[PDB]
């Protein structure tokens with residue numbers, strides 16, 4: 074068992090080898106440990122963000138505005154690209170590995186004989202890191218689902234659902250209603266429940282009513298469009314806003330969370346936040362002439378958004394790797410509406426699809442030995458007017474980031 078002075082990699086190896094399969098399903102274990110360590114109140118204001126797509130960029134938009142307003146802010150996010158330290162930002166910055174090791178050591182001591190999962194352990198450690206930082210606002214990205222996610226042990230002041238879409242091949246009972254019910258478990262009685270999904274399943278309204286949360290839906294209570302763009306909640310209008318480097322829907326969800334939070338925020342901080350907001354690997358431009366873009370899209374809903382974005386930036390060359398338990402067929406079909414040339418590569422581990430599993434869905438494609446090789450060939454092929462897009466999984470993006478030492 075590692076200690077406070079152990080390298081972070083030792084802590085991660087420890088967590089990766091945890092035998093979590095037989096432990097009791099649900100939040101009782103992690104809740105008990107959080108109580109023991111007084112971790113349930115990481116800041117006086119808490120925002121929890123669930124969704125299929127858009128959690129990270131919603132969180133980063135909240136973060137950018139609140140930081141522009143001079144507040145102390147922490148964000149917990151998952152998964153990571155290159156470094157575990159990406160998962161906890163304070164004042165917009167990653168912490169040292171040594172701070173993480175010390176925090177993990179406090180969690181290890183506090184849990185006693187209670188078993189915890191990797192993500193439970195990580196989430197409690199993030200809460201400890203936030204607590205010691207004396208923050209104004211903490212933003213929690215839900216890891217998976219909502220009702221049973223480790224982040225749902227904390228009572229949020231505003232909760233949000235960013236979108237609802239399928240994000241996995243077939244599964245028992247796995248439909249929009251089921252997906253929505255589970256996410257809505259992050260809602261709280263007497264608190265705003267912000268839904269940025271325009272095609273909202275009824276289950277979300279049902280859970281809000283069951284819990285007594287105040288539901289504020291996109292296209293019902295608030296909406297947006299579009300120099301700049303515009304946002305409205307009843308008679309409140311924010312007009313001619315800067316267009317952020319995040320999907321607009323998610324910036325709009327962020328503004329709604331901030332509006333219903335009642336935090337006092339200047340027009341200036343909102344505009345400055347919007348101009349700053351971005352996240353690595355979310356429509357990230359790495360190079361120009363040819364345009365090289367990285368995007369972690371891994372389901373059809375995300376691919377639809379990416380196609381709509383590519384349309385507004387000559388041939389499109391896609392470097393693609395995906396996980397096998399994802400809807401490969403639907404993701405590739407959607408992307409194929411805009412992609413001209415396909416560069417398929419395998420992903421590693423047991424969950425990765427082979428280049429062949431991708432190519433079998435593509436009328437014409439080339440296959441490569443790995444993502445780096447595919448990407449380098451695309452770059453070699455590209456004319457200055459071309460767009461090279463690296464997509465399909467956070468793993469595919471991460472391979473290219475590591476190759477570029479970004």
Ligand SMILES: Nc1ncnc2c1ncn2[C@@H]1O[C@H](COP(=O)(O)OP(=O)(O)O)[C@@H](O)[C@H]1O
Nearest residue numbers: 125126127128129130322355369370374375378
């Ligand atoms: N509102 C949205 N609609 C469709 N796709 C989205 C939306 N928000 C994000 N995406 C897609 O999902 C990917 C991950 O975005 P992110 O904000 O990190 O979401 P999450 O944290 O839920 O995975 C993006 O690169 C983009 O492909």
Ligand SMILES: [Mg+2]
Nearest residue numbers: 128129151152
């Ligand atoms: Mg995320």
